[PDB]
Amino acid sequence: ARYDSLLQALGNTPLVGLQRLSPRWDDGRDGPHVRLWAKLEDRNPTGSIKDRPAVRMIEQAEADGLLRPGATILEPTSGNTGISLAMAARLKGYRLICVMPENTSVERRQLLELYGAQIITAVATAKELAATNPSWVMLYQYGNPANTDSHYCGTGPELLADLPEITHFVAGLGTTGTLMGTGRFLREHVANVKIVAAEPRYGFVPELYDPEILTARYSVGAVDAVRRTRELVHTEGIFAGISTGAVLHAALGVGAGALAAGERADIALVVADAGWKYLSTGAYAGSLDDAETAL
Amino acid sequence: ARYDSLLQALGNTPLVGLQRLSPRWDDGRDGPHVRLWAKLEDRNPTGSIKDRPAVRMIEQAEADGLLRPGATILEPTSGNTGISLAMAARLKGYRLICVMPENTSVERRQLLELYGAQIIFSSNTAVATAKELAATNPSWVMLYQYGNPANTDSHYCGTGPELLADLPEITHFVAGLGTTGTLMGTGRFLREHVANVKIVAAEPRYPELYDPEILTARYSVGAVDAVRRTRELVHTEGIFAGISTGAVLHAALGVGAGALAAGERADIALVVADAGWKYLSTGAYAGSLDDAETALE
Numbered sequence: 001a002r003y004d005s006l007l008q009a010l011g012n013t014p015l016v017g018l019q020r021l022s023p024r025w026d027d028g029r030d031g032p033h034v035r036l037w038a039k040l041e042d043r044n045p046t047g048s049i050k051d052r053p054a055v056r057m058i059e060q061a062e063a064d065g066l067l068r069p070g071a072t073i074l075e076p077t078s079g080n081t082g083i084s085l086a087m088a089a090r091l092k093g094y095r096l097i098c099v100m101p102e103n104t105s106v107e108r109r110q111l112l113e114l115y116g117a118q119i120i121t122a123v124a125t126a127k128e129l130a131a132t133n134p135s136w137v138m139l140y141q142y143g144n145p146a147n148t149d150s151h152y153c154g155t156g157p158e159l160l161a162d163l164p165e166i167t168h169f170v171a172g173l174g175t176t177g178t179l180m181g182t183g184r185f186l187r188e189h190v191a192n193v194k195i196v197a198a199e200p201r202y203g204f205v206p207e208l209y210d211p212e213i214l215t216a217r218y219s220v221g222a223v224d225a226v227r228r229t230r231e232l233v234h235t236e237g238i239f240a241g242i243s244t245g246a247v248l249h250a251a252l253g254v255g256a257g258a259l260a261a262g263e264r265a266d267i268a269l270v271v272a273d274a275g276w277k278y279l280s281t282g283a284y285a286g287s288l289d290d291a292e293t294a295l
Numbered sequence: 296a297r298y299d300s301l302l303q304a305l306g307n308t309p310l311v312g313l314q315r316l317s318p319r320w321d322d323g324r325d326g327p328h329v330r331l332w333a334k335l336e337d338r339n340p341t342g343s344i345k346d347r348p349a350v351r352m353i354e355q356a357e358a359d360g361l362l363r364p365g366a367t368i369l370e371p372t373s374g375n376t377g378i379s380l381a382m383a384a385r386l387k388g389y390r391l392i393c394v395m396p397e398n399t400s401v402e403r404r405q406l407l408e409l410y411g412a413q414i415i416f417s418s419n420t421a422v423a424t425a426k427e428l429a430a431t432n433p434s435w436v437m438l439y440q441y442g443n444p445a446n447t448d449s450h451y452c453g454t455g456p457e458l459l460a461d462l463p464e465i466t467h468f469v470a471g472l473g474t475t476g477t478l479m480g481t482g483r484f485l486r487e488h489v490a491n492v493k494i495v496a497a498e499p500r501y502p503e504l505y506d507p508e509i510l511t512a513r514y515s516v517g518a519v520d521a522v523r524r525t526r527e528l529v530h531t532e533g534i535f536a537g538i539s540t541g542a543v544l545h546a547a548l549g550v551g552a553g554a555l556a557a558g559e560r561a562d563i564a565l566v567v568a569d570a571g572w573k574y575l576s577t578g579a580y581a582g583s584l585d586d587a588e589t590a591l592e
């Protein structure tokens with residue numbers, strides 16, 4: 001565990017059994033086990049899963065000759081990808097400018113500046129800004145196969161190593177990188193694997209998306225998401241972000257499926273970031289209806 | 296990396312070279328290297344170093360027969376130790392009640408309840424209230440992190456061995472001094488294996504575990520210095536740490552400048568104890584440093 005740079009202290013995230021919240025942790029008289037396992041991607045340099053594609057997208061753009069020393073990077077995001085890229089650019093000697101509206105909160109804005117980024121439909125605006133300079137590159141996490149590659153070459157191998165007996169992989173669907181990359185890999189090695197997606201109730205379709213890979217899709221409501229998140233910290237001591245709530249809700253559906261049909265299940269689910277940056281929204285305390293409108 | 300419980304997903308935290316912020320990362324014509332290495336103890340179940348002694352103190356109290364199934368735990372803390380114990384108690388089947396003042400914020404309070412703790416407040420009133428609750432029924436226990444050798448043991452048996460393994464060539468270990476667990480435990484261990492090791496403490500300007508023999512230096516750090524360093528650390532190295540890391544880093548840069556001036560090698564390990572997330576609401580990462588200084592108190 002000795003790294004000459006933070007960029008290497010990346011991935012190799014733990015997988016943790018959720019014994020209290022699993023439908024059936026122990027095999028028994030009433031049937032085989034139905035287990036949830038949690039992949040803690042919040043144990044990453046910036047505390048989110050986006051550290052994986054961020055570093056990969058920079059290394060690929062280098063390899064394709066787009067990125068020369070002292071160059072400048074551009075991307076549409078004011079969230080987790082922004083943070084990740086800013087960390088990674090700073091360390092690779094690059095300059096960053098992120099792509100967001102004025103509307104975007106003071107919290108998100110100041111966090112990016114703290115990491116050293118600079119501040120500026122939004123996908124299109126960005127493409128135009130890259131077309132301004134030869135040394136200005138736009139990585140495009142929504143289209144970039146390096147996003148999908150980072151999970152193919154990291155996340156999937158780690159899961160399979162920790163959980164050879166895996167039956168399902170559940171994860172949030174945003175850029176689609178996680179599900180595409182991890183699902184492509186898991187299918188190759190575990191033929192019977194099911195790849196389940198969790199998403200918000202209502203946008204665009206990413207170039208990375210391939211529908212064949214998914215077995216199922218769950219549309220999750222705010223109240224459900226929040227409730228699950230809260231259950232997850234109350235019961236398991238894991239303080240996750242809101243997308244984990246959605247993922248967990250979907251994973252409990254799947255799990256209830258296996259339990260009803262008397263089958264084994266080992267369900268791996270992605271904890272993509274922690275609850276720290278969602279705390280200011282009150283959503284962890286008070287009523288769930290307060291929390292729903294407060295999001 | 297497959298764990299049947301979160302309690303095992305603990306320790307084995309990474310050590311990361313700070314190349315930009317190090318006084319001299321490369322050995323050269325002008326002299327030997329002077330390096331800072333960062334032990335990322337924010338990569339822990341609850342995001343702080345207190346996960347290590349919290350789990351240890353529960354396992355020891357079990358072994359000493361204080362903790363039977365369904366029992367209840369008590370401690371003076373509304374911070375990181377409280378969070379850690381609440382996580383750990385919940386998973387070991389125990390009940391928790393924490394001990395705090397009125398002053399303590401709504402943030403800290405709600406975070407503890409979110410982990411499942413219960414609430415008692417007035418720092419020493421609160422220690423005494425807890426004492427009373429152990430006297431209610433003998434199966435209610437107070438772990439006493441400030442006195443408990445299991446606190447010191449967790450760094451002796453984990454933190455130190457991990458450092459030495461990653462950094463055999465270590466010359467200094469720098470860490471914040473609160474309960475003293477980190478410095479005592481890690482320093483006792485490092486001295487046994489690296490004779491010439493220097494154990495430097497960082498603390499703020501104005502415990503039974505404390506042993507003075509162990510420290511080679513003490514640094515008193517001002518709020519403005521602390522905050523500035525924290526900020527430098529995220530700008531330059533991409534590591535978003537808590538305020539105590541700022542203090543630690545300030546001390547580690549003093550030590551480091553020493554070694555550079557005297558033409559000596561240095562490999563200085565320093566503890567990043569938690570992350571900046573829970574300190575962000577205080578504005579201290581933005582604005583003026585004088586705003587940040589008064590906004591912390």
Ligand SMILES: O=C(Nc1cccc(-c2ccccc2)c1)Nc1ccc(C(=O)O)c(O)c1
Pocket residue numbers: 076077078079080081082141171172173174175198199200201220221222225242243246247
């Ligand atoms: O896709 C995301 N979240 C997500 C995924 C799946 C489900 C939910 C969700 C959250 C609350 C309620 C219901 C669904 C949320 N997050 C996400 C965050 C950051 C970025 C980024 O580019 O910076 C992103 O592309 C997606």
Ligand SMILES: O=C(Nc1cccc(-c2ccccc2)c1)Nc1ccc(C(=O)O)c(O)c1
Pocket residue numbers: 372373374375376377440470471472473474497498499500516517518521538539542543
């Ligand atoms: O020891 C701590 N911080 C620390 C240590 C050393 C130096 C400083 C510091 C911070 C700002 C300016 C100057 C010094 C701060 N924190 C700490 C947090 C929680 C607990 C707990 O028991 O719950 C604790 O015992 C200590």
Ligand SMILES: *Cc1c(COP(=O)(O)O)cnc(C)c1O
Pocket residue numbers: 048049050080081172173174175176177178179241243244272273
């Ligand atoms: C990116 C992200 C997701 C979705 O992951 P993709 O691989 O982009 O689909 C979910 N939750 C959080 C917190 C994220 O940052």
Ligand SMILES: *Cc1c(COP(=O)(O)O)cnc(C)c1O
Pocket residue numbers: 343344345375376471472473474475476477478537539568569
């Ligand atoms: C506990 C703690 C310290 C001090 O550690 P001790 O081993 O108790 O001296 C410093 N910083 C943070 C954030 C802590 O939680």
